[PDB]
Swiss-Prot record, chains A, B, C, D:
Effect seen on changing E45K: In AMYLD1; early-onset amyloid polyneuropathy
Disease tied to this protein: Amyloidosis, hereditary systemic 1: A form of hereditary systemic amyloidosis, a disorder characterized by amyloid deposition in multiple tissues resulting in a wide clinical spectrum. AMYLD1 is an autosomal dominant form due to transthyretin amyloid deposition. Protein fibrils can form in different tissues leading to amyloid polyneuropathies, amyloidotic cardiomyopathy, carpal tunnel syndrome, systemic senile amyloidosis. The disease includes leptomeningeal amyloidosis that is characterized by primary involvement of the central nervous system.
Gene source species: Homo sapiens (Human)
Protein name: Transthyretin
GO molecular function: hormone activity; hormone binding; identical protein binding; molecular sequestering activity; protein-containing complex binding
Subcellular location: Secreted; Cytoplasm
Result of altering Y105H: In CTS1; amyloid deposit on carpal tunnel; patients show no other abnormalities
Annotated family: Belongs to the transthyretin family.
Additional observations: Tetramer dissociation and partial unfolding leads to the formation of aggregates and amyloid fibrils. Small molecules that occupy at least one of the thyroid hormone binding sites stabilize the tetramer, and thereby stabilize the native state and protect against misfolding and the formation of amyloid fibrils. Two binding sites for thyroxine are located in the channel. Less than 1% of plasma prealbumin molecules are normally involved in thyroxine transport. L-thyroxine binds to the transthyretin by an order of magnitude stronger than does the triiodo-L-thyronine. Thyroxine-binding globulin is the major carrier protein for thyroid hormones in man.
Portion held of the full protein: 30 to 144 of 147
Amino acid sequence: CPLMVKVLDAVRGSPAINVAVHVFRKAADDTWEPFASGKTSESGELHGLTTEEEFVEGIYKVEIDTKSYWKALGISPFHEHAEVVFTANDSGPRRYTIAALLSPYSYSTMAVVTN
Amino acid sequence: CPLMVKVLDAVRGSPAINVAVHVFRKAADDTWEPFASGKTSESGELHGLTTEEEFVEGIYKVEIDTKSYWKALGISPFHEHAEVVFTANDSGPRRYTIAALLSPYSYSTMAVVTN
Amino acid sequence: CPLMVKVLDAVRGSPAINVAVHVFRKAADDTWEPFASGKTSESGELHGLTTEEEFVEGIYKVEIDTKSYWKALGISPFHEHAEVVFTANDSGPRRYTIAALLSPYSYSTMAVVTN
Amino acid sequence: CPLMVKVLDAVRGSPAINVAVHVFRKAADDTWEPFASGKTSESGELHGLTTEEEFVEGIYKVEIDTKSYWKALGISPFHEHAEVVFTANDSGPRRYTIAALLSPYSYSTMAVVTN
């Protein structure tokens, strides 16, 4: 599992469950091509998005559908979604964990990159 | 000033100065059209991006060029940029302060919306 | 104004108004001595806590009464308060802005230190 | 495991390893009594601090020794430590995960409370 996404809800103090997550890879024509997607689990995690073979060096975007999550909770949000854009680089073995902490008018994102 | 952007550096405990900021508005054809741009001042603030007349209802994207900021400080950061996407002025004109707190592998963004 | 405290509410996208703030200074006997206190204004800021003459070198604690703030809004939050503990003025006088971003189950704090 | 602490480093994009963590419980005389302590593991986690039997309702403080962590990395920090103060309440079965994201001049803390 070279890429995992974890989403937390700061209003409820819980994992953010059933959040839609879309991953894109930047194409040669500078457009964003769909790469992988899913919904977070009961633990707020989304595993199995890609494989070591497919997840080559490139620029990737992880779009987390925060607005739909807050609307389902009846809470008025600011953002349309939380976007995390980064370059994946082959400086030895790597695993990426993209974490997002959500509030209606704020979000924090952190990336844990390990060997 | 209906739109202001403020950027802070969590490594140095200071305003993030000379950070490039690009604002886009979603067009009828679903593409991102350039709307305004600028660089943060010595206080880490960017004022004067738009006016009450030009800043109509719409979906806006504020792209903060965090990677160039960290690279100039000798840090190879995780993110390409910090992106803030939101619907503006949908219940009438509002004043928006988009704040971003930067670290090499994390960022937080908050919006203060006033009537 | 060598010490200012700014508090924001991430649920409402607004300044956190009327939040109680207590400042303490560590005494020679290692206890926390009351130093200054106040309530945030309509802008979520608390100015005038101290002066350049009184704000000598030392270890200071800024306690922000987040629980009372959330309870007044009808939310039962996780934290009793947000605590910021730091050494001040150890390389000469500095100006400190302590900012706190609040959510029911999370908080972020940042300090901007200027010479 | 009713209480777990997780600490992340936003400068390095990694778990914060070997960070000292001290837990205290508020006594009847209003002082903080030592309750449990440890150091975070290679995953930045600290497990086994307490048991279901010992972790009764009360006010607890988790002190994370951030200054010593940054000093070991040669980075000048703002805070003496990160403090998380909360009430533990018996509203059905519960587990607490206290997470802290560290930067030299900022920290974010989140609590995940699950059944």
